[PDB]
């Protein structure tokens, strides 16, 4: 039960990976990417403000594993059956003015006195679940996130050089890099492992001056969050040969292709998974921008 | 004064997308008893068999 000052930036919540084997904080891994531009453009539009009304808080019996689940779904490897209310209806509760369900540090949801498990501030998580509960809507017909517009954003957000391309437009860039066999997936799982909440609870709380200081601090943790995430969608991915070294080449880094089969070089969204990621991005982005 | 050597071709070209196999073959063909065209028709005819 510890306060803040910034939830991340606090030991336990570090974000690392694997560079064919080492670690390196993501900023360090994304600086190893290259973009051939290619016709088109990705004129960002406007994320449709969230569907305000969130799922009804249903007690339900159990310990909703949320950090783990939200991510298993976003960049997992196949989350079988995502969006099921069950986990979110419950997560909704946390978004009330007074409850017992404490959000366990490790990434869970409890009752009364969780006991032992040092949960989060009750306030921070309050503002958190406020929005990320709506996330348990993406399933329903009238709330779908409407994904191809949203991926426009993911892009000038991920690639697109600062400022220059941070001006609404840019060419789809086909991204490639020196990989290491089964690179994309191995990398994704280092991320499935990651502690997300720490990132959001902090993202949905931090005042305003501190919020910007924070945006810069995780500029990269965040870009990395969705690089591995966007490749799930990006069409073809193949390996470009070079000179003994191999270079993973990614179809188009920004143009979600709404593909649902199961590649090998990467993750793969079932259809309903897009329904979920599309929605998750709508929220993080509406939020990232303020 | 010789050190008659194999010089595995690859140690000459930088764009090794053509280069293949190796010095290991000279080792082998050095053993094959020089064959005639009629001779090969046979070696091949019997492998395929």
UniProtKB/TrEMBL annotation, chain A:
<protein>
    <submittedName>
        <fullName>Viral structural protein 5</fullName>
    </submittedName>
</protein>
């Amino acid at each position: 039960q510890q306060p803040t000052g910034g939830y991340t930036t606090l030991e336990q919540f570090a974000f690392t990976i694997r560079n064919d084997g080492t670690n390196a904080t993501p900023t360090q891994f994304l600086q190893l990417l290259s973009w051939e531009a290619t016709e088109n453009e990705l004129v960002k539009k406007t994320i449709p403000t969230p569907e305000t009304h969130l799922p009804s808080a249903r007690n339900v019996p159990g310990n909703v594993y949320i950090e783990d689940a939200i991510t298993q779904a976003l960049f997992g490897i196949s989350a079988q059956n995502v969006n099921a209310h069950g986990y979110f209806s419950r997560l909704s509760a946390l978004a009330l003015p007074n409850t017992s369900a404490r959000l366990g540090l490790d990434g869970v949801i409890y009752n009364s006195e969780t006991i032992n498990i040092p949960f989060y501030d009750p306030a921070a998580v309050a503002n958190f679940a406020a929005t990320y509960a709506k996330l348990g809507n993406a399933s329903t017909p009238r709330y779908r996130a409407d994904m191809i517009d949203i991926y426009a954003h993911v892009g000038l957000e991920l690639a697109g050089t600062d400022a220059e391309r941070a001006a609404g437009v840019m060419p789809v860039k086909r991204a490639k890099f020196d990989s290491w066999e089964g690179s994309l997936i191995s990398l994704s799982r280092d991320v499935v492992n990651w502690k997300i909440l720490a990132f959001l609870i902090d993202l949905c709380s931090l005042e305003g001056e501190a919020l910007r200081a924070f945006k810069t601090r995780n500029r990269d943790v965040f870009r990395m969050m969705l690089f591995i995430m966007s490749t799930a969608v990006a069409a073809n991915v193949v390996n470009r040969k070079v000179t003994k070294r191999v270079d993973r080449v990614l179809e188009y880094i920004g143009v979600n292709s709404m593909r649902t089969a199961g590649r090998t070089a990467t993750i793969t969204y079932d259809l309903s998974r897009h329904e979920f990621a599309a929605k998750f991005l709508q929220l993080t982005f509406t939020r990232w921008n303020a | 004064r010789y050190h008659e050597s194999v010089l595995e071709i690859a140690d000459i070209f930088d764009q090794a997308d053509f280069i293949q196999t190796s010095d290991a073959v000279r080792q082998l063909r050095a053993l094959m008893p020089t064959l005639s065209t009629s001779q090969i028709r046979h070696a091949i005819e019997r492998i395929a068999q």
